[PDB]
Amino acid sequence: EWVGFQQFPAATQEKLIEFFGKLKQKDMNSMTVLVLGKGGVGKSSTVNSLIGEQVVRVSPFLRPVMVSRTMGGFTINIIDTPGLVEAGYVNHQALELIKGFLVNRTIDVLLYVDRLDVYRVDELDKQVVIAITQTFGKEIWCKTLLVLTHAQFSPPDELSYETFSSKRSDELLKTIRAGSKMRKQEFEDSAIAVVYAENSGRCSKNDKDEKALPNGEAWIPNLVKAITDVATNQRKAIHV
């Protein structure tokens, strides 16, 4: 059984049950979420948050792991990956160790993880988005969510949270677009959503006990809702 689900706030559990329900009615009774990102960005910490338990390794400084948990006839399987940067360049080994582990699997969602609290995208970020396109295909971005960790960050000086985070995520979506060399046509129709994650224990709980963003909202319920939505978005899943 899924022990982490029993830890969640009454209100998170309730919402998750509602969301797996919408999938179950379409005959989906399992889904596989791949997690990809540059090293250091909180991929493993987002997976522990989602799973509700300490399942993958978390560190400042080989080889992909999968974590399946089941609840009420539904199975979430989430693949944590080694980071894709051996700085200051793309780590092509980690990136085909990942493909090795994915052969014969169906990936329903990609959580592309980066940090909110960063002031710029660079050429390495575009190199990473091209190394992902060269490995899984253009098609993977029709199945992607941009997850931005460190969501509780307060910018200095004093552009607002909402200026900072709209520019940050605008810059990252443009880097995905350019590195992907997707055409304007497939890109709007891909409409890749941006969900926010705060994995810190210092993280504001709202008044229903759920991990909340600055705007008030339970972020794990939003993350599972946007995942459920991409799992259901009627664009086709990725095989290999």
Ligand X SMILES: Nc1nc2c(ncn2[C@@H]2O[C@H](COP(=O)(O)OP(=O)(O)NP(=O)(O)O)[C@@H](O)[C@H]2O)c(=O)[nH]1
Q: Cis omega before residue 183 (within 30°)? A: no
> Cβ of residue 51: shortest distance to ligand X, in angstroms?
12
Q: Determine which residue in the list 5, 12, 31, 44 makes contact with ligand X, applying CB under 6 A.
A: 44
Q: What is the contact mask toward ligand X in residues 146 to 165, using x (rule: CB under 6 A)?
A: ---xx---------------
CA 236 vs. chain centroid, Å, equals: 18
201 near ligand X (CB under 6 A): no
Closer residue to ligand X in complex, CB, 29/154: 154
Taking the C-alpha atoms of residue 63 and residue 67, their distance in angstroms, rounded to an integer, is 13
> Cβ of residue 149: shortest distance to ligand X, in angstroms?
4
Q: Which DSSP state fits 236?
A: P
The reply, when asked if residue 199 is annotated as ligand binding, is yes
149 near Mg ion (CB under 5 A): no
What is the DSSP pairing of strand 109-115 with strand 65-70?
A: unpaired
Closer residue to Mg ion in complex, CB, 110/218: 110
Residue 60 interacting entry, from ligand X, Mg ion, none, C-beta within 5 to 8 Å by type: ligand X
Closer residue to Mg ion in complex, CB, 44/190: 44
Between the alpha carbon of residue 144 and those of residues 4, 17, 35, 113, the distances in Å are 25, 22, 10, 10
Between the alpha carbon of residue 125 and those of residues 48, 87, 181, the distances in Å are 25, 11, 14
Which amino acid belongs to residue 174?
Answer: K
> Cβ of residue 26: shortest distance to Mg ion, in angstroms?
31
CA 158 vs. chain centroid, Å, equals: 28
Residues 36-55 that bind Mg ion (CB under 5 A): 44
SS3 category, 195: strand
Closer residue to ligand X in complex, CB, 138/150: 150
58 near ligand X (CB under 6 A): yes
| Binding footprint of ligand X on the chain (CB under 6 A) | 37, 39-45, 58-60, 82-83, 149-150, 197-200
